[PDB]
Amino acid sequence: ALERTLSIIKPDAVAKNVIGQIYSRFENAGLKIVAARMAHLSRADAEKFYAVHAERPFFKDLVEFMISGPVMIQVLEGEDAILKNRDLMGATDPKKAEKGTIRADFADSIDANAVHGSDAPETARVEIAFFFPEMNVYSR
Amino acid sequence: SMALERTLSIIKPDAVAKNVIGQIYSRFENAGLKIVAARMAHLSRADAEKFYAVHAERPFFKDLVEFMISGPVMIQVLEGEDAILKNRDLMGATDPKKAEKGTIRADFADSIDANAVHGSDAPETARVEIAFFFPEMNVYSR
Ligand SMILES: Nc1ncnc2c1ncn2[C@H]1C[C@H](O)[C@@H](COP(=O)(O)O)O1
Ligand SMILES: [Cl-]
Ligand SMILES: [Cl-]
Numbered sequence: 001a002l003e004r005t006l007s008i009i010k011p012d013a014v015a016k017n018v019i020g021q022i023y024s025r026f027e028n029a030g031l032k033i034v035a036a037r038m039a040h041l042s043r044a045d046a047e048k049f050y051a052v053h054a055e056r057p058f059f060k061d062l063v064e065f066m067i068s069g070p071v072m073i074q075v076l077e078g079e080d081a082i083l084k085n086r087d088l089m090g091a092t093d094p095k096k097a098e099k100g101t102i103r104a105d106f107a108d109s110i111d112a113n114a115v116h117g118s119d120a121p122e123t124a125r126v127e128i129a130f131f132f133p134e135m136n137v138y139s140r
Numbered sequence: 141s142m143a144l145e146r147t148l149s150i151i152k153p154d155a156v157a158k159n160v161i162g163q164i165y166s167r168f169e170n171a172g173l174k175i176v177a178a179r180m181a182h183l184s185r186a187d188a189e190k191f192y193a194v195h196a197e198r199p200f201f202k203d204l205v206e207f208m209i210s211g212p213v214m215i216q217v218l219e220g221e222d223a224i225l226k227n228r229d230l231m232g233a234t235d236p237k238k239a240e241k242g243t244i245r246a247d248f249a250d251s252i253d254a255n256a257v258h259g260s261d262a263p264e265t266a267r268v269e270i271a272f273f274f275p276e277m278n279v280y281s282r
Pocket of ligand 2: 115116117
């Protein structure tokens with residue numbers, strides 16, 4: 001159960017003051033919050049984070065929405081963490097997300113879709129390393 | 141209407157281990173307080189000692205320090221109307237035995253040593269405790 005994934009509670013969900021409810025989704029599902037911080041990303045950092053989408057027409061929108069306000073960033077650890085977090089988040093478009101997922105419950109739109117989660121083992125590694133030094137990640 | 145205040149909150153290692161960070165956060169957020177800074181940390185002995193200096197000559201001091209450093213904690217700044225007192229009412233009495241039902245300490249604390257949470261007790265300690273753990277550039281009022 002040492003797999004880790006990178007989660008972000010996006011500015012829309014922070015602004016709703018539902019950080020705790022989203023955290024409980026993780027915790028109740030058996031994931032442990034092993035690193036965490038509130039931050040306000042710069043444009044340059046949002047651009048780096050979303051680099052893989054630099055050529056897509058929704059790039060500017062991913063970026064603008066991620067820097068519109070503070071975010072809560074955390075590392076989630078546990079068995080099958082990457083896929084479990086994805087299951088908890090639900091579909092990218094909240095209109096398509098299953099009932100009781102984070103996006104179905106807290107997302108207003110595909111832009112304001114509440115949360116990010118790493119999509120694969122290598123993106124989890126890169127994203128965790130982007131936001132946290134290992135000395136500030138506390139496995140337990 | 142009262143003064144918008146910031147206070148310093150810590151979810152102690154007992155409650156982090158319980159995986160009830162979310163539940164405690166929702167206590168704050170449902171009471172109309174906003175999380176305006178946060179980070180997970182593992183305090184050093186020295187940092188815990190500094191933080192608890194007001195209790196340095198007391199006999200529970202060593203225990204306060206060893207318990208604060210026994211595992212990672214979740215630290216946050218809470219902002220809202222009357223935040224200092226509000227947080228304290230939500231936490232409940234220092235001794236979970238004495239804490240009203242529905243408080244954080246009643247629901248998540250196992251004892252006076254393992255008592256789940258800290259909150260600043262006054263405006264001046266709030267100021268000092270926030271500055272101890274966060275630079276202002278990482279506190280984001282909204
Ligand atoms: N208009 C208004 N609304 C809400 N909160 C306010 C206002 N003016 C100051 N403050 C804040 C600043 C302090 O935390 C507290 C008392 O002000 P202090 O001067 O520090 O004793 O209230
Ligand atoms: Cl995303
Ligand atoms: Cl304390």
